[PDB]
C-alpha cells in the first residue's frame, strides 16, 4: 500500500439544530351534552 | 305484500336518517316477514332489505345478525336469489364498512360454493359476486387467503369465458389497492405468465393488473423480473406503466 | 391565545390540537367552526386566518371527520401565500385523522376520542385493539377487564406495562427506519423528541384506522406502513407479555421478561455471520439502540455493535446516521469495568471515521475514562493499543484537547507505557 492518509468522507450524521416544543394549545370543541346537526349518532355512539 | 312494503320504502327515503327512529319497530316484523314469505314475493322482499339497510347505514347493526343467518337459510342455486343476494351483499357492505368483518366469515362458505359449480350463462353470477368483492375493501385482509385461491382459478382457467376472466382480473387489480399482497405473490404471478401465453385477449387486462401488483410489491418483485421479462419478449409486450415500474425498481428510485 | 404563544416562542415550534367532535364538519371554504360567546350559533374560521396568527414553526393536528379538507385547504393558503409572496410550508408539520371523503368511526367498543387516544396514549388503545381481533381466540380468557387491571407503569421498563412501552417505541423506531428515506427520517424522528413521538404513534394510528375504513393524513407524506413485516412481531410480543396476566394478577406469579430483545439480538448476530457484503442493512439496527438503554441486555450490545462497525467504515456511517453517539458517549459515564473493553473498541472505530467527536469527548470529560485504561496494566496491550489512539485523535490539532489531556497528564502516563 501507499504511504497516504485515506481521504475522510462528508460525514452529514450531525443534527443540523435540535427543535423545542416550548408550548402547546389545546383547543377543544367539544360541546359536551350536544350533537353536531350534520351526523346523526347513533343511540350507543361513541361516548369516551 | 307488494304495497305494503313499498310504501315503508318511500317513507323511509323521504324522511332520511330520521326513519332510524322507527326501525325497533320495523326490523323485527320484516325479517319474520322474509321468513314466512313464500315464492316470487321473496326476492322482492330482500329487493327492499337492500334499500332499507342502504338508508339506516350504520344502525342496522343490531339486527345485521339476524339477516345473515337469513341469507344462509335462503341462498339457494336458483339464479335469480342469488343475483339479488348479491346486491344485497353490497349493500351491507357499503352500510357497515369496517364493522362487515364480524359477518363476512359466515358468507364466506356460499361465495366459495359459487365459484366451485357456477352453470350461469357465461357466469354472469360469479362477475356479479367479483365486483362485490371489490367492494369488501380492507375486510378482506384476515380472509384474503380463502377467497383468492377461487378467484386466480377463475381468470386461470381457458374453458371459463372470457369476460368472467377480465372481472377476475380487474377485481385483483382493485383489491391490490388496498389489500397486501406480498403473502400471495406466487400464487398470483405465476397464473398471470401463463395467462399471457394461453390467451392474447387478456394479455392487455393482465399486464395492468402485473403492474398494479408490482407497484404495490416494490423490491419484494425484484425476485420475478427475469422470469417476467422472459415471457414478455417471447410475445413482445411492451407496456409504459411496468417498464417505467421495472425500471425503477432495479434503478432503486421510490416513487 | 394563538398569538400570545406565538410571541412567547417566535422561533420555536408551538402545538395546535383542535377537536371538532363537537362542531359541525370542516366546509370546502377552508373554514373550521367554533362557537358564539352564548353558545347559541357555530360560528366559521377561516384556516388562512388560522395560519395568519401561528407562525412558520408550528405543528397542526386536526382530529375531526372531514380532516383531510382542512391539509388541503392549508397546503392551497400555502400556495397563496407563495403566490403573494413573489409579488411557511416545509416549516408546518400537519396530522389529520382521516382523508376528506373519510368519517369517523361510530363503534361503541371504541373511544370517540380514536385518533388523539392513539397519537398520546398508544399502548392504552393498543392493547384493546388487541382485544378485539379475531386472534384473540388464540388466548381465551383475556378480555378488556384484565386489561384495565393491567399491573406496572409506562416508566418501570422492568414491570409488566413499561415492557410494553419499551418494545414498542423499538418496533415504531424500528418500522421507520427501514421504511422512510434516510433524510426524512431524522428529520422527524431525531430533530426533537415530541414530534419523533407523534410520529411514531401515528404509526400504530395508521394501522388501526385503516381496519375502520380510516385512513390518516399527514403533511409529510409517509407511504403505507400498515403491511410491514415488524408488525406482525408486535402482536407476538404482546401476545406472550400478556398471556401471563391471569397468573400475574389472581396467581401473583412474578412477570418474566419477554424474548423480544433477545431474539432480535440474536437475529442480528445471525447477520453478521455472513454480512461481510453490502447488501441490504439489518432491520434490527434501531432496536440494537434500544437495548443499550438498559442494563440487562448491554454487555451482549455493546460487543455486537463493536463487531458490526468492524465490518468497514461504511457500517459506522451507518451507526452513527441511526443515531449511537449520544448513547454510546452516555455509557463513558459508567464505572462497570466490564464495559471498558467494549467502549475503547467501539470508540476507536467511530474517531477512526468521524475525528470531529474529539469535540464532543473533552466537553463531556470522557477523556478521563479512557486515562483510566490507558493506566491499568492487567488491562491486555491489545485494547491498550486503541486507547492511545483514540487519544491520539482527540489531541489532533486541536489546542482545546491539548490543553485539556496536558492537565490529565498524558505524557507521564504514555512514557510508563
Given at each position: 500500500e501507499k504511504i497516504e492518509g485515506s481521504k475522510s468522507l462528508?460525514?452529514?450524521?450531525?443534527?443540523?439544530d435540535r427543535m423545542k416544543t416550548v408550548s402547546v394549545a389545546l383547543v377543544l370543541c367539544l360541546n359536551v351534552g350536544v350533537d353536531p346537526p350534520d351526523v346523526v349518532k347513533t343511540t350507543p355512539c361513541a361516548r369516551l | 305484500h307488494t304495497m305494503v312494503v313499498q310504501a315503508i320504502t318511500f317513507i323511509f327515503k323521504s324522511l332520511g336518517l330520521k326513519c332510524v327512529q322507527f326501525l325497533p319497530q320495523v326490523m323485527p316484523t320484516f325479517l319474520n316477514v322474509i321468513r314466512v314469505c313464500d315464492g316470487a314475493i321473496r326476492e322482492f322482499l330482500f329487493q327492499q332489505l337492500g334499500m332499507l339497510v342502504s338508508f339506516v347505514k350504520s344502525h342496522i347493526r343490531p339486527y345485521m345478525d339476524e339477516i345473515v343467518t337469513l341469507m344462509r337459510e335462503f341462498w339457494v342455486m336458483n339464479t335469480s336469489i342469488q343475483s339479488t343476494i348479491i346486491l344485497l351483499i353490497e349493500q351491507i357492505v357499503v352500510a357497515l364498512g369496517g364493522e362487515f368483518k364480524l359477518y363476512l366469515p359466515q358468507l364466506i362458505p356460499h361465495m366459495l360454493r359459487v365459484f366451485m359449480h357456477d352453470n350461469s350463462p357465461g357466469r354472469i353470477v360469479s362477475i356479479k359476486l367479483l365486483a362485490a368483492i371489490q367492494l369488501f375493501g380492507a375486510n378482506l385482509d384476515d380472509y384474503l387467503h380463502l377467497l383468492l385461491p377461487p378467484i386466480v382459478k377463475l381468470f386461470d382457467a381457458p374453458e371459463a369465458p372470457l369476460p368472467s376472466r377480465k372481472a377476475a382480473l380487474e377485481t385483483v387489480d382493485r383489491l391490490t389497492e388496498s389489500l397486501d399482497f406480498t403473502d400471495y405473490a406466487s400464487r398470483i404471478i405465476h397464473p398471470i405468465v401463463r395467462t399471457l401465453d394461453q390467451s392474447p385477449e387478456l394479455r392487455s387486462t393482465a399486464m395492468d393488473t402485473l403492474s398494479s401488483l408490482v407497484f404495490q410489491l416494490g423490491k419484494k418483485y425484484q425476485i420475478f423480473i427475469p422470469m417476467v421479462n422472459k415471457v414478455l419478449v417471447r410475445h413482445r409486450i411492451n407496456h409504459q406503466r411496468y417498464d417505467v415500474l421495472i425500471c425503477r425498481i432495479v434503478k432503486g428510485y421510490t416513487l | 391565545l394563538c398569538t400570545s404563544l406565538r410571541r412567547n416562542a417566535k422561533e420555536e415550534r408551538v402545538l395546535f390540537h383542535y377537536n371538532g367532535?363537537?362542531?359541525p364538519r370542516p366546509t370546502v371554504n377552508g373554514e373550521v367552526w367554533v362557537f358564539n360567546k352564548n353558545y347559541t350559533q357555530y360560528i366559521p374560521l377561516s384556516i388562512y386566518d388560522l395560519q395568519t396568527w401561528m407562525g412558520s414553526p408550528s405543528i397542526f393536528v386536526y382530529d375531526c371527520s372531514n380532516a383531510g379538507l382542512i391539509v388541503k385547504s392549508f397546503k392551497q393558503f400555502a400556495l397563496q401565500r407563495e403566490q403573494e409572496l413573489e409579488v411557511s410550508m416545509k416549516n408546518c408539520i400537519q396530522l389529520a385523522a382521516c382523508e376528506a371523503t373519510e368519517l369517523l368511526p361510530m363503534i361503541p367498543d371504541l373511544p370517540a376520542d380514536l385518533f388523539t387516544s392513539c397519537l398520546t396514549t398508544p399502548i392504552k388503545i393498543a392493547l384493546r385493539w388487541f382485544c378485539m381481533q379475531k386472534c384473540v381466540s388464540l388466548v381465551p380468557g383475556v378480555t378488556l377487564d384484565l386489561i384495565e387491571k393491567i399491573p406496572g407503569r409506562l416508566n418501570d421498563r422492568r414491570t409488566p406495562l413499561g415492557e410494553l412501552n419499551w418494545i414498542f417505541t423499538a418496533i415504531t423506531d424500528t418500522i421507520a427506519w427501514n421504511v422512510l428515506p434516510r433524510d426524512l427520517f431524522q428529520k422527524l424522528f431525531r430533530q426533537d423528541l415530541l414530534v419523533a413521538s407523534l410520529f411514531r404513534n401515528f404509526l400504530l394510528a395508521e394501522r388501526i384506522m385503516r381496519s375502520y375504513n380510516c385512513t390518516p393524513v399527514s403533511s409529510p407524506r409517509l407511504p403505507p406502513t400498515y403491511m410491514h413485516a415488524m408488525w406482525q412481531a408486535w402482536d407476538l410480543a404482546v401476545d406472550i407479555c400478556l398471556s401471563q396476566l391471569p397468573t400475574i394478577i389472581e396467581e401473583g406469579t412474578a412477570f418474566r421478561h419477554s424474548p423480544f430483545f433477545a431474539e432480535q439480538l440474536t437475529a442480528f448476530q445471525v447477520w453478521l455471520?455472513?454480512?461481510?457484503?453490502?447488501?441490504?442493512?439489518?432491520?434490527q439496527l434501531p432496536i440494537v439502540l434500544q437495548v443499550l438503554l438498559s442494563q440487562v441486555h448491554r454487555l451482549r450490545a455493546l460487543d455486537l455493535l463493536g463487531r458490526f462497525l468492524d465490518l468497514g467504515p461504511w457500517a459506522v456511517s451507518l451507526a452513527l446516521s441511526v443515531g449511537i453517539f449520544p448513547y454510546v458517549l452516555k455509557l463513558l459515564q459508567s464505572s462497570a469495568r466490564e464495559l471498558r473493553p467494549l467502549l475503547v473498541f467501539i470508540w476507536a472505530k467511530i474517531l477512526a471515521v468521524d475525528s470531529s467527536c474529539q469535540a464532543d469527548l473533552v466537553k463531556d470529560n470522557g477523556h478521563k475514562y479512557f486515562l483510566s485504561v490507558l493506566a491499568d496494566p492487567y488491562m491486555p496491550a491489545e485494547h491498550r493499543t486503541m486507547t492511545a489512539f483514540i487519544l491520539a485523535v482527540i489531541v489532533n490539532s486541536y489546542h482545546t484537547g491539548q490543553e485539556a489531556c496536558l492537565q490529565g497528564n498524558l505524557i507521564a502516563i504514555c512514557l510508563e507505557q
Open positions: 462528508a460525514q452529514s450524521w450531525r443534527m443540523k | - | 367532535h363537537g362542531v455471520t455472513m454480512g461481510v457484503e453490502n447488501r441490504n442493512p439489518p432491520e
